[PDB]
Protein backbone atom coordinates (compact mmCIF):
# COMPACT_ATOMS: atom_id res chain seq x y z
CA UNK A 1 0.00 0.00 0.00
CA UNK A 2 2.96 2.31 0.63
CA UNK A 3 4.30 1.74 -2.86
CA UNK A 4 1.07 3.11 -4.30
CA UNK A 5 1.66 6.23 -2.20
CA UNK A 6 5.12 6.79 -3.72
CA UNK A 7 3.78 6.08 -7.20
CA UNK A 8 1.18 8.82 -6.77
CA UNK A 9 3.49 11.60 -5.58
CA UNK A 10 5.93 10.80 -8.39
CA UNK A 11 3.12 11.62 -10.83
CA UNK A 12 2.01 14.82 -9.15
CA UNK A 13 -0.60 13.36 -6.81
CA UNK A 14 -0.37 15.27 -3.57
CA UNK A 15 -2.30 14.52 -0.35
CA UNK A 16 -4.99 16.75 1.16
CA UNK A 17 -5.93 16.87 4.84
CA UNK A 18 -9.47 16.45 6.16
CA UNK A 19 -10.88 16.63 9.68
CA UNK A 20 -13.74 15.16 11.74
CA UNK A 21 -17.08 15.57 9.94
CA UNK A 22 -15.58 16.77 6.64
CA UNK A 23 -16.78 15.23 3.32
CA UNK A 24 -14.14 13.89 0.90
CA UNK A 25 -17.05 13.65 -1.58
CA UNK A 26 -20.85 13.75 -1.71
CA UNK A 27 -23.90 12.28 -3.42
CA UNK A 28 -24.79 15.54 -5.16
CA UNK A 29 -21.43 15.77 -6.96
CA UNK A 30 -21.12 14.60 -10.62
CA UNK A 31 -17.36 14.06 -10.41
CA UNK A 32 -16.06 10.50 -10.23
CA UNK A 33 -13.13 10.07 -7.90
CA UNK A 34 -10.73 7.43 -6.78
CA UNK A 35 -10.02 8.13 -3.12
CA UNK A 36 -6.80 6.73 -1.79
CA UNK A 37 -7.38 7.03 1.96
CA UNK A 38 -3.82 6.76 3.27
CA UNK A 39 -4.53 7.51 6.92
CA UNK A 40 -7.57 8.00 9.12
CA UNK A 41 -11.07 6.61 9.46
CA UNK A 42 -14.03 7.44 7.26
CA UNK A 43 -17.55 6.18 6.66
CA UNK A 44 -19.51 5.77 3.46
CA UNK A 45 -23.04 7.12 4.03
CA UNK A 46 -26.33 7.60 2.17
CA UNK A 47 -29.32 9.88 2.79
CA UNK A 48 -32.89 8.64 2.42
CA UNK A 49 -35.39 10.75 0.48
CA UNK A 50 -36.47 11.40 4.09
CA UNK A 51 -33.10 12.88 5.02
CA UNK A 52 -32.45 9.89 7.27
CA UNK A 53 -28.71 9.06 7.50
CA UNK A 54 -27.63 5.54 6.52
CA UNK A 55 -24.11 4.55 7.50
CA UNK A 56 -23.35 1.91 4.89
CA UNK A 57 -19.63 1.20 5.40
CA UNK A 58 -16.49 2.20 7.32
CA UNK A 59 -12.98 2.66 5.97
CA UNK A 60 -9.59 2.91 7.64
CA UNK A 61 -6.17 4.19 6.67
CA UNK A 62 -4.67 2.69 3.54
CA UNK A 63 -7.53 1.70 1.26
CA UNK A 64 -9.10 3.04 -1.95
CA UNK A 65 -12.69 4.06 -2.72
CA UNK A 66 -13.79 4.43 -6.34
CA UNK A 67 -17.02 6.41 -6.60
CA UNK A 68 -17.36 5.47 -10.26
CA UNK A 69 -16.58 2.61 -12.66
CA UNK A 70 -13.28 2.46 -14.57
CA UNK A 71 -15.07 0.77 -17.44
CA UNK A 72 -17.16 3.91 -18.10
CA UNK A 73 -16.37 6.56 -15.45
CA UNK A 74 -20.08 6.71 -14.50
CA UNK A 75 -21.17 6.90 -10.84
CA UNK A 76 -21.56 3.56 -9.03
CA UNK A 77 -23.74 4.78 -6.17
CA UNK A 78 -24.93 7.98 -4.54
CA UNK A 79 -23.04 8.20 -1.25
CA UNK A 80 -20.84 10.40 0.97
CA UNK A 81 -17.35 9.68 2.29
CA UNK A 82 -17.15 11.42 5.68
CA UNK A 83 -14.04 11.57 7.86
CA UNK A 84 -14.59 10.20 11.37
CA UNK A 85 -11.13 10.50 12.92
CA UNK A 86 -9.37 13.71 13.91
CA UNK A 87 -6.96 13.91 11.00
CA UNK A 88 -7.10 12.10 7.64
CA UNK A 89 -4.82 11.99 4.58
CA UNK A 90 -6.18 11.08 1.16
CA UNK A 91 -5.02 11.26 -2.45
CA UNK A 92 -7.91 12.52 -4.55
CA UNK A 93 -7.62 11.33 -8.14
CA UNK A 94 -9.97 11.95 -11.04
CA UNK A 95 -11.16 8.62 -12.44
CA UNK A 96 -9.51 8.92 -15.88
CA UNK A 97 -6.15 9.86 -14.34
CA UNK A 98 -6.35 6.76 -12.16
CA UNK A 99 -7.15 4.62 -15.18
CA UNK A 100 -4.01 5.81 -16.95
CA UNK A 101 -1.64 5.54 -14.00
CA UNK A 102 -2.73 1.91 -13.86
CA UNK A 103 -1.99 0.97 -17.50
CA UNK A 104 1.64 2.05 -16.93
CA UNK A 105 2.06 -0.19 -13.91
CA UNK A 106 -0.12 -3.27 -13.65
CA UNK A 107 1.21 -3.92 -10.15
CA UNK A 108 -0.69 -1.02 -8.62
CA UNK A 109 -3.60 -1.90 -10.85
CA UNK A 110 -3.59 -5.26 -9.03
CA UNK A 111 -3.35 -3.54 -5.66
CA UNK A 112 -6.57 -1.63 -6.37
CA UNK A 113 -8.22 -4.74 -7.80
CA UNK A 114 -7.48 -6.63 -4.58
CA UNK A 115 -8.97 -3.90 -2.38
CA UNK A 116 -12.18 -4.46 -4.35
CA UNK A 117 -11.99 -8.21 -3.71
CA UNK A 118 -11.42 -7.21 -0.10
CA UNK A 119 -14.78 -5.43 0.20
CA UNK A 120 -16.59 -8.19 -1.62
CA UNK A 121 -15.38 -10.94 0.70
CA UNK A 122 -15.97 -8.67 3.69
CA UNK A 123 -19.62 -7.94 2.87
CA UNK A 124 -20.22 -11.64 2.35
CA UNK A 125 -18.56 -12.39 5.68
CA UNK A 126 -20.65 -9.74 7.40
CA UNK A 127 -23.71 -11.14 5.68
CA UNK A 128 -22.99 -14.71 6.73
CA UNK A 129 -22.39 -13.77 10.35
CA UNK A 130 -25.67 -11.83 10.51
CA UNK A 131 -27.79 -14.58 8.93
CA UNK A 132 -26.43 -16.91 11.58
CA UNK A 133 -26.32 -14.83 14.74
CA UNK A 134 -28.53 -11.83 14.00
CA UNK A 135 -27.68 -8.51 15.63
CA UNK A 136 -25.54 -10.47 18.08
CA UNK A 137 -23.38 -11.45 15.10
CA UNK A 138 -23.03 -7.89 13.82
CA UNK A 139 -21.94 -6.38 17.15
CA UNK A 140 -19.47 -9.18 17.79
CA UNK A 141 -18.04 -8.56 14.35
CA UNK A 142 -17.93 -4.82 14.91
CA UNK A 143 -16.03 -5.63 18.09
CA UNK A 144 -13.85 -8.36 16.59
CA UNK A 145 -12.25 -6.13 13.96
CA UNK A 146 -11.87 -3.25 16.41
CA UNK A 147 -10.02 -5.71 18.64
CA UNK A 148 -7.80 -6.98 15.81
CA UNK A 149 -7.01 -3.55 14.39
CA UNK A 150 -6.97 -1.23 17.41
CA UNK A 151 -6.65 -3.71 20.25
CA UNK A 152 -3.56 -3.99 22.44
CA UNK A 153 -2.79 -6.70 25.02
CA UNK A 154 -2.78 -5.54 28.65
CA UNK A 155 -3.01 -7.24 32.04
CA UNK A 156 -6.75 -6.52 31.66
CA UNK A 157 -7.30 -8.09 28.25
CA UNK A 158 -7.30 -6.27 24.94
CA UNK A 159 -7.98 -2.60 25.23
CA UNK A 160 -9.82 -1.16 22.24
CA UNK A 161 -7.39 1.69 21.67
CA UNK A 162 -9.89 3.91 19.89
CA UNK A 163 -10.79 7.56 20.36
CA UNK A 164 -13.52 7.52 23.01
CA UNK A 165 -15.22 10.23 20.90
CA UNK A 166 -15.05 8.34 17.60
CA UNK A 167 -16.64 5.33 19.29
CA UNK A 168 -19.81 7.42 19.46
CA UNK A 169 -19.63 7.58 15.66
CA UNK A 170 -20.19 3.82 15.87
CA UNK A 171 -30.60 0.91 20.84
CA UNK A 172 -30.84 -2.87 21.28
CA UNK A 173 -27.10 -2.60 20.68
CA UNK A 174 -27.02 -1.78 24.40
CA UNK A 175 -28.88 -4.99 25.19
CA UNK A 176 -26.08 -6.92 23.50
CA UNK A 177 -23.20 -4.87 24.95
CA UNK A 178 -24.85 -5.38 28.34
CA UNK A 179 -25.25 -9.05 27.62
CA UNK A 180 -21.53 -9.14 26.77
CA UNK A 181 -20.45 -7.42 29.98
CA UNK A 182 -22.72 -9.89 31.77
CA UNK A 183 -21.09 -12.95 30.19
CA UNK A 184 -17.68 -11.38 30.86
CA UNK A 185 -16.91 -11.02 27.16
CA UNK A 186 -16.02 -7.32 27.37
CA UNK A 187 -15.61 -4.70 30.12
CA UNK A 188 -15.80 -0.91 29.99
CA UNK A 189 -13.02 0.61 32.09
CA UNK A 190 -11.09 3.89 31.84
CA UNK A 191 -13.12 5.21 28.91
CA UNK A 192 -12.13 2.06 27.00
CA UNK A 193 -13.32 -1.45 26.19
CA UNK A 194 -11.40 -4.53 27.26
CA UNK A 195 -12.17 -7.80 25.52
CA UNK A 196 -11.68 -10.71 27.90
CA UNK A 197 -13.27 -13.43 25.79
CA UNK A 198 -11.92 -13.11 22.25
CA UNK A 199 -13.09 -16.64 21.56
CA UNK A 200 -16.68 -15.57 22.21
CA UNK A 201 -16.35 -12.96 19.49
CA UNK A 202 -14.70 -15.43 17.12
CA UNK A 203 -17.56 -17.81 17.94
CA UNK A 204 -20.36 -15.47 16.87
CA UNK A 205 -18.54 -13.74 14.02
CA UNK A 206 -17.06 -16.84 12.27
CA UNK A 207 -17.00 -15.73 8.69
CA UNK A 208 -15.68 -12.31 9.72
CA UNK A 209 -12.92 -14.02 11.64
CA UNK A 210 -12.07 -16.13 8.63
CA UNK A 211 -12.15 -13.06 6.42
CA UNK A 212 -9.73 -11.34 8.75
CA UNK A 213 -7.48 -14.39 8.78
CA UNK A 214 -7.55 -14.59 4.97
CA UNK A 215 -7.17 -10.89 4.14
CA UNK A 216 -4.97 -9.69 7.02
CA UNK A 217 -2.87 -12.72 8.17
CA UNK A 218 -0.43 -10.56 10.13
CA UNK A 219 -2.96 -8.66 12.25
CA UNK A 220 -4.94 -11.84 12.81
CA UNK A 221 -1.99 -13.84 14.10
CA UNK A 222 -0.91 -11.12 16.55
CA UNK A 223 -3.70 -12.34 18.85
CA UNK A 224 -4.27 -15.95 17.77
Amino acid sequence: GSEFKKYLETNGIKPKQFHKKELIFNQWDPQEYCIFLYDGITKLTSISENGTIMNLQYYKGAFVIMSGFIDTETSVGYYNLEVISEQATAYVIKINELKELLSKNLTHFFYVFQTLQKQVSYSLAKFNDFSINGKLGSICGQLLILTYVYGKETPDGIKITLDNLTMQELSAVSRIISKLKQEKVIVYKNSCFYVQNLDYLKRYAPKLDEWFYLACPATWGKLN
Side-chain angles (χ1 to χ4, degrees):
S2 283
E3 294 294 75
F4 189 53
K5 196 276 284 62
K6 297 185 182 69
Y7 185 58
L8 295 178
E9 317 204 75
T10 49
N11 269 77
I13 298 181
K14 272 61 182 185
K16 302 68 178 180
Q17 289 256 163
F18 309 73
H19 302 297
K20 306 186 63 181
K21 288 181 168 53
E22 210 175 357
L23 289 299
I24 302 181
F25 74 61
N26 67 84
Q27 38 184 298
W28 323 107
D29 184 317
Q31 304 304 298
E32 296 313 311
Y33 317 78
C34 166
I35 307 298
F36 182 55
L37 181 61
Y38 185 71
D39 176 282
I41 292 175
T42 62
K43 65 169 179 172
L44 211 219
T45 69
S46 170
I47 314 302
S48 312
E49 81 177 318
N50 333 302
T52 335
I53 312 297
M54 293 300 319
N55 311 311
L56 301 180
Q57 180 82 73
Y58 289 105
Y59 302 99
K60 114 158 175 295
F63 197 98
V64 1
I65 303 166
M66 305 219 96
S67 63
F69 294 109
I70 32 101
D71 195 3
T72 329
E73 296 176 46
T74 85
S75 192
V76 54
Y78 305 148
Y79 319 127
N80 303 300
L81 187 50
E82 182 194 314
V83 179
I84 287 178
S85 63
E86 259 295 67
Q87 297 161 296
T89 288
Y91 293 72
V92 186
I93 307 172
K94 286 193 298 72
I95 192 67
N96 41 74
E97 286 184 286
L98 181 281
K99 194 184 313 182
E100 184 170 301
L101 317 181
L102 298 186
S103 310
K104 303 289 182 52
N105 189 305
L106 289 307
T107 294
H108 295 135
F109 191 165
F110 291 145
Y111 170 67
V112 172
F113 190 104
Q114 187 190 64
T115 67
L116 240 37
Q117 308 187 70
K118 229 77 157 186
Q119 298 185 66
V120 170
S121 61
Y122 174 94
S123 281
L124 291 171
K126 236 171 62 185
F127 180 68
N128 169 279
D129 288 1
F130 177 73
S131 295
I132 295 177
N133 309 320
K135 253 303 171 187
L136 184 270
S138 303
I139 302 307
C140 281
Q142 194 80 60
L143 286 185
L144 183 53
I145 59 185
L146 251 37
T147 297
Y148 280 172
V149 172
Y150 300 105
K152 302 298 176 293
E153 249 164 298
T154 73
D156 294 296
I158 294 176
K159 188 180 171 192
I160 301 309
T161 315
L162 241 199
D163 311 354
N164 44 63
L165 292 176
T166 282
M167 290 291 268
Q168 66 84 187
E169 270 282 36
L170 305 171
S171 174
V173 179
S174 309
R175 235 184 187 64
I176 299 173
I177 297 290
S178 298
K179 175 184 179 57
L180 299 179
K181 297 184 177 184
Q182 179 74 286
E183 307 199 67
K184 303 192 177 183
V185 181
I186 52 180
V187 311
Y188 198 75
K189 174 169 57 194
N190 302 322
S191 299
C192 286
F193 272 124
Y194 292 74
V195 171
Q196 307 189 186
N197 196 8
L198 177 67
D199 297 284
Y200 183 90
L201 301 188
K202 291 165 78 281
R203 197 214 313 305
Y204 294 107
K207 213 49 172 180
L208 225 229
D209 194 28
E210 174 189 299
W211 176 83
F212 223 106
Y213 164 81
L214 287 186
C216 296
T219 289
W220 193 82
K222 299 191 302 180
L223 285 190
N224 308 77

